[PDB]
Design a protein around this ligand. Structure first.
Ligand SMILES: CCS(=O)(=O)c1ccc(CC(=O)Nc2nc(-c3ccccc3)c(C(=O)c3ccccc3CC(C)C)s2)cc1
Lengths: 8, 243
């Protein structure tokens, strides 16, 4: 969830 | 590789770390006289277990966010697949923070930097996890006895993160390749700087594993006691990595 957002 | 490509990797990793180190070493060192008073320590011990767990969760998340940004800047990390990036960060993010934390640890009085001032381990007594606290303190004490430079920390943390043994890796060989390059970079820098004596003295990987395990265990003990606190007041990222 949050990790995906931080990496994009 | 070749001798020139490795040195290029050395500087690029060191650069990637500098840009994401959270707090400059000088800043931490300048603050070493700033120690919590007896009254402030008692104040910390008077706080509720849950408020204190909430505060540690928030600071842990802050630190981790810099490790995420470090990985994004780390060479070859973004060239791995979305699945592997996430796997590597779920297992290694906390371990990297654990290593970085030795920068904020003062071996002379056995205190850590926390919320603007330095305090010893008694500061954290409200958490009700003394064994974990001692372990963390012992770990930082053992790292400080190595007298790490920033460049050394940069290169060692790259390696902690880029670990090809992590379960769930789809492109394992691709991660093995990057690992080996960073290994060469680290070991080359140690050779060049006459600091290879530290290879033997770095903690086993099972020591970091143990600390992170302890963290998750103590968190699950706490979450069982206060489910709604974790649900309502804990950072989402922290919950994502740890519960
Ligand atoms: C890390 C990059 S840095 O620039 O060196 C930096 C930047 C900013 C700070 C300030 C800071 O956040 N200090 C904290 N200290 C501790 C702590 C706590 C118990 C013992 C020892 C240090 C924090 C923690 O919450 C923590 C850290 C590691 C593992 C586990 C925990 C919480 C557990 C007990 C639930 S946060 C420190 C260091």
């Amino acid at each position: 969830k949050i990790l995906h957002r931080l990496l994009q | 590789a070749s001798l020139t490509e490795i040195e290029h990797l050395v500087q690029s990793v060191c650069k990637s770390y500098r840009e994401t180190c959270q707090l400059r070493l000088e800043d931490l060192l300048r603050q070493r006289s700033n120690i919590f008073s007896r009254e402030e320590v008692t104040g910390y011990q008077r706080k509720s277990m849950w408020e204190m767990w909430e505060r540690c969760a928030h600071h842990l998340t802050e630190a981790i966010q810099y490790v995420v940004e470090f990985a994004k800047r780390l060479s070859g990390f973004m060239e791995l697949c979305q699945n592997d990036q996430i796997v590597l960060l779920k297992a290694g993010a906390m371990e990297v923070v654990l290593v970085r934390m030795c920068r904020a640890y003062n071996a002379d009085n056995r205190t850590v930097f926390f919320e603007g001032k330095y305090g010893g381990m008694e500061l954290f007594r409200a958490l009700g996890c003394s064994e974990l606290i001692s372990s963390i303190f012992d770990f930082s004490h053992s790292l400080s006895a190595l007298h790490f430079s920033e460049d050394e920390i940069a290169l060692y943390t790259a390696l902690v993160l880029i670990n090809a043994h992590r379960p769930g890796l789809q492109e394992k060989r691709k991660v093995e390749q990057l690992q080996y390059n960073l290994e060469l970079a680290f070991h080359h820098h140690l050779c060049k700087t006459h600091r290879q004596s530290i290879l033997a003295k770095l903690p086993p990987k099972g020591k970091l594993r143990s600390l992170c395990s302890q963290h998750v265990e103590r968190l699950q003990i706490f979450q069982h006691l206060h489910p709604i606190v974790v649900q309502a007041a804990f950072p989402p990222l922290y919950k994502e990595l740890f519960s």
